[PDB]
Symmetry: C3
Subunit: 249 residues, 3 copies
């Protein structure tokens, strides 16, 4: 015979599609009747074609009535290969899926603005704001005086330690000064301090530097100090060199 414009028949229930082995075409009108059969490619009413090319090659196709898909298989040397299920547009759209050409860092969406960093070091120069406190090994200030205050440090004394000269505690302002003067016998001599006392001479004394004669007086006196001068008085009966110190601020 031939493939006729009328189907060869309706497939009932309980048909083994393996038994459909002469050429033709058959209609399964009921999904439920596909359910009660065997080797249907899908439980779905559908159209089956058989092409019995030879005893060793029986081809089949299956078109599901609702377009679930289209199926084909072949029996070769008394074994049925598995059905193939066509992919079609009702299954997926390729434009829904990620191309390899669009898989890179910049394209990845939802990337964080910043990232939790791992352990690392710094050069001190990357510290660009703030003031390190004492509790972290800092001096708690950006000024010299403030740093000293945080750690309780004084400032350096200054001095000029010459044969005549001065020394100054700059924490408090105290100044100490010294020198020598030649005094006339039983009389006064004026001295001029190496530097002026900024506000006030507080005290002083004079010392006989000579091997003054025993049994004679060799008294001394420091008096009448200004910011720049004082008066040294010599009790020895002869001209003598007296040394002196003075202090103030």
């Amino acid at each position: 015979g031939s493939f006729t414009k009328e189907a060869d028949g309706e497939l009932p229930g309980g048909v083994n599609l393996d038994s459909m082995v002469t050429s033709g075409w058959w209609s399964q009108s009921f999904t439920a009747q596909a359910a009660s059969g065997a080797n249907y490619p899908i439980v779905r009413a559908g159209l089956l074609h058989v092409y019995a090319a030879s005893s060793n090659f029986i081809y089949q196709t299956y078109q599901a009535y609702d377009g679930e898909s289209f199926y084909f298989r072949c029996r070769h040397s008394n074994t049925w290969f598995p059905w193939r299920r066509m992919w079609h547009g009702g299954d997926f759209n390729p434009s829904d899926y990620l191309l390899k050409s669009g898989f890179y860092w910049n394209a990845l969406p939802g990337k964080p603005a910043t990232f939790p960093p791992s352990a690392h070091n710094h050069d001190v120069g990357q510290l660009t704001s703030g003031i390190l406190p004492l509790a972290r090994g800092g001096v708690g200030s950006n000024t010299a005086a403030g740093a000293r205050s945080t750690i309780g440090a004084g400032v350096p004394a200054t001095a000029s330690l010459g044969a005549s000269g001065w020394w100054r505690d700059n924490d408090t302002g105290l100044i100490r000064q010294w020198g020598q003067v030649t005094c006339p016998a039983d009389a006064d001599a004026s001295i001029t301090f190496p530097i002026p006392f900024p506000t006030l001479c507080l005290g002083g004394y004079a010392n006989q530097t000579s091997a003054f004669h025993p049994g004679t007086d060799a008294s001394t006196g420091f008096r009448g100090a200004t910011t720049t001068t004082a008066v040294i008085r010599n009790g020895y009966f002869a001209q003598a060199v007296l040394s002196w110190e003075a202090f103030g601020r």
Copy 2:
């Protein structure tokens, strides 16, 4: 004729599928015979259908016997379009591939816990533990005394630089004090230091502040110091004001 339930024939070797141009259907039973032909869509035994719609349109389909796939093409105006190879479930599964809807930061697996950071700065306040050592510009301690120790600094001297007063080196404890006293002629006067020496008066001296008469004695003496008092002795034959200094700790 018509499409018969028996195939029109078996395809041998060396068939050019371009020559298959009258309507019907033909079986290729041997992959090796497909190999020795031309314009097979795949080297595979299979079923070929020809639909010679007209001289200008010859359609063909090819079903591979092992389900490798299903193929179709058409000859239009004496040119054969290329075969189309159907995609089917034995080729790939779409659920194996990444959807664009699942391509975002949180979904990306294997992301590191932390990330190597790039160059950046800090405010000193983000330093929240540790003690900066001297080798990095720190003071190597969280205490004032420890900081001073790291850099070798002394503490401030204190003082009260009044007409009578005191000065104190707080590095060592040394205290220096001064004042004036009115002494009776050829006799002693007691002085009370501006502040007490914490443990010990170490020394002192007295100075005649007056223009004492020449040829008379104007000796002085500092003796008998406690922590709070001393005795100033006046050798001048008249009442006189003597100044004094004392030191201790």
Copy 3:
């Protein structure tokens, strides 16, 4: 009838494929004639097959002449399901798309070398280079003397504050020393300073520690100092203990 090796006919323009409802096969030779019809699965010349299985099931297939694709649909209970468009190799290649198995951190290309970090803290020990300046709470140096210089600090005075002893300002080198000596009547006694003056004795004085007799002389003198010794002179007519101070550097 039967499916004949000659097509049932050529489809002209204006054909509604819904009306193609008796079994057979038909050729559309002109895309433009597909354009002027209805329910073509694609505007393309092509081959249409009809399988009228029953009044309730009319199946159709459509092969586009240029291989645009292959289409199928079915009329079930007087309603046409939509055409299915086969996916085929001319549409996409699955190996162009990203597998889920290749979607992980290391595979993502174009990842940055480093990443902008988010807010975070540090232990001071991760500061491993540089010298913190004063403007950031540092001492601007890795040396003790340099740190002192940045903040303007002095060094500690040293001393030995015994009954005889010394005190030294290490900012300037000034040394002050003191002690007592027993002097013979109207004569000299040598003293040896508690420590040597490194270069120079600058001055000194002596003080009578005794309740010297009034009306007698009790002058004193400090003279002839070296780096290690000086001479104390006693004007009192009796043996006496004199105290002294000396200063230098």
